[PDB]
Amino acid sequence: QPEPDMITIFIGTWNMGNAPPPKKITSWFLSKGQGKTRDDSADYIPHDIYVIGTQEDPLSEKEWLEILKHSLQEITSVTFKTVAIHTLWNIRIVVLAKPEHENRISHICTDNVKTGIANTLGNKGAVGVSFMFNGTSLGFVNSHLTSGSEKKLRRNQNYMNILRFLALGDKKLSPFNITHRFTHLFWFGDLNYRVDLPTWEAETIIQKIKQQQYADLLSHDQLLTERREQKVFLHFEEEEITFAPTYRFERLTRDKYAYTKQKATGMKYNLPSWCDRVLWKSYPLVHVVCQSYGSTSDIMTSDHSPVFATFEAGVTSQFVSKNGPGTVDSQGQIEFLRCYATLKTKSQTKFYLEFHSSCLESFVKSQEGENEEGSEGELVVKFGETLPKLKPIISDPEYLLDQHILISIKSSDSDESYGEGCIALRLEATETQLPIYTPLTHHGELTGHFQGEIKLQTSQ
Ligand SMILES: Cc1ccsc1CNC(C)(C)CO
Numbered sequence: 460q461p462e463p464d465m466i467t468i469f470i471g472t473w474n475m476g477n478a479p480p481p482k483k484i485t486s487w488f489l490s491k492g493q494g495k496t497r498d499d500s501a502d503y504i505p506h507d508i509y510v511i512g513t514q515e516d517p518l519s520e521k522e523w524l525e526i527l528k529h530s531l532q533e534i535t536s537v538t539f540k541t542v543a544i545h546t547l548w549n550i551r552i553v554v555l556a557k558p559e560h561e562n563r564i565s566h567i568c569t570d571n572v573k574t575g576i577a578n579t580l581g582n583k584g585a586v587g588v589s590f591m592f593n594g595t596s597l598g599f600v601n602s603h604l605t606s607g608s609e610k611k612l613r614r615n616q617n618y619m620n621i622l623r624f625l626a627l628g629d630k631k632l633s634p635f636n637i638t639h640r641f642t643h644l645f646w647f648g649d650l651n652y653r654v655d656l657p658t659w660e661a662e663t664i665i666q667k668i669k670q671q672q673y674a675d676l677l678s679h680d681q682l683l684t685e686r687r688e689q690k691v692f693l694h695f696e697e698e699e700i701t702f703a704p705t706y707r708f709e710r711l712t713r714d715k716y717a718y719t720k721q722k723a724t725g726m727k728y729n730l731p732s733w734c735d736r737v738l739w740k741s742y743p744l745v746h747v748v749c750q751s752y753g754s755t756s757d758i759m760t761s762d763h764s765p766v767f768a769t770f771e772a773g774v775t776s777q778f779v780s781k782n783g784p785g786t787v788d789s790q791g792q793i794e795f796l797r798c799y800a801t802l803k804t805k806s807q808t809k810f811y812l813e814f815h816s817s818c819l820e821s822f823v824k825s826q827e828g829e830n831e832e833g834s835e836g837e838l839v840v841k842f843g844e845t846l847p848k849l850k851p852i853i854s855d856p857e858y859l860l861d862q863h864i865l866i867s868i869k870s871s872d873s874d875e876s877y878g879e880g881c882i883a884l885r886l887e888a889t890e891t892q893l894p895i896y897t898p899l900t901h902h903g904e905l906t907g908h909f910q911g912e913i914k915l916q917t918s919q
Pocket residue numbers: 683686687694695696
């Protein structure tokens with residue numbers, strides 16, 4: 460049985476509004492309804508991995524797992540295996556995989572983050588799962604962020620607390636948060652961003668939804684506008700939205716949006732909004748293609764409609780040469796030429812680099828760079844040709860060209876990272892000086908840039 464070089468992944472997010480689901484929820488897993496939907500001819504073809512995020516979930520883990528497994532078995536005639544399940548309050552994540560993947564999946568991690576202090580600690584936060592699929596690391600985050608049209612800044616703060624404090628992936632990657640730990644990271648949930656239009660325009664918004672004219676609404680979607688101004692989800696992707704707002708509906712129909720202020724809403728309006736989202740972030744030059752992104756039309760127990768997204772995701776095999784793992788492959792080397800970091804920091808300490816990658820036996824520390832002043836105020840840390848030669852565990856180009864090098868720039872004084880980024884080894888050529896670039900972030904905010912040249916030697 461050959462190892463796959465591609466898998467498909469289902470992402471579901473549903474805020475269940477504290478109500479049990481209806482007897483049939485198959486439309487969700489079939490990506491049927493509104494938006495970018497899945498072709499009928501694929502209905503019997505199982506996804507490799509299903510990841511289900513719920514919010515306001517009133518079920519026990521046992522009750523929900525039974526409903527999910529029964530639904531997938533009805534669709535596919537496959538009995539899926541439970542990879543992981545984790546619940547914080549009424550926020551839950553389930554990961555199911557085809558039984559043929561049981562031995563391909565390892566290093567399963569789960570964690571949660573509670574957002575807010577005192578008043579604002581008690582029901583919002585995130586749960587997450589990570590694991591290895593052969594040679595590929597996968598991470599999944601389900602978050603229920605702060606509610607209310609006038610709290611987009613709070614939502615952005617919730618986002619930063621979740622990416623800092625969610626402990627998934629390889630703990631040896633100590634300078635790196637979840638936005639750098641995975642080949643593919645999917646972040647979904649009731650993110651609770653709203654269409655920021657005046658309250659008086661509610662009936663106008665409903666009219667536009669009835670006409671399937673979403674352009675004037677999406678131009679006011681707080682997640683799109685905050686992302687465009689680099690306030691949140693920096694370096695994440697989202698498929699184009701072509702489905703109606705998924706909140707806030709009257710239950711038992713989809714014909715009516717319930718937007719007017721009520722005692723039950725804390726006297727807040729809920730203008731129709733795209734609260735329920737799926738975003739992703741993959742390492743550079745890895746195959747990731749969104750194949751569906753939409754909402755169901757026929758599941759009406761909640762004031763939200765379920766959202767689905769599906770992806771093709773590139774995966775690599777667990778590589779074994781005569782040499783690595785457990786030694787170097789003296790034929791392989793990675794060289795950095797003329798490299799420098801441009802940092803936004805006002806501080807003046809010395810900096811060094813750490814290189815982390817699963818193609819190295821352990822991370823590599825550089826010597827300190829030489830600081831200079833950029834022409835527009837910046838700190839430029841020059842490394843020249845002083846960076847160590849990296850010795851990969853395997854030199855075979857079918858392995859090495861698929862790998863990635865994580866870079867952290869650290870203060871000599873404090874050993875704290877000022878910036879993290881990632882460089883693909885999927886080069887246009889080997890034994891050739893080629894430009895490399897990554898932005899640098901810390902706590903998922905832009906802090907600088909790393910650029911220079913690379914020279915990769917493989918056994919070929
Ligand atoms: C968030 C947003 C809105 C318009 S462009 C943009 C940035 N998205 C990218 C990074 C995929 C394009 O380079």
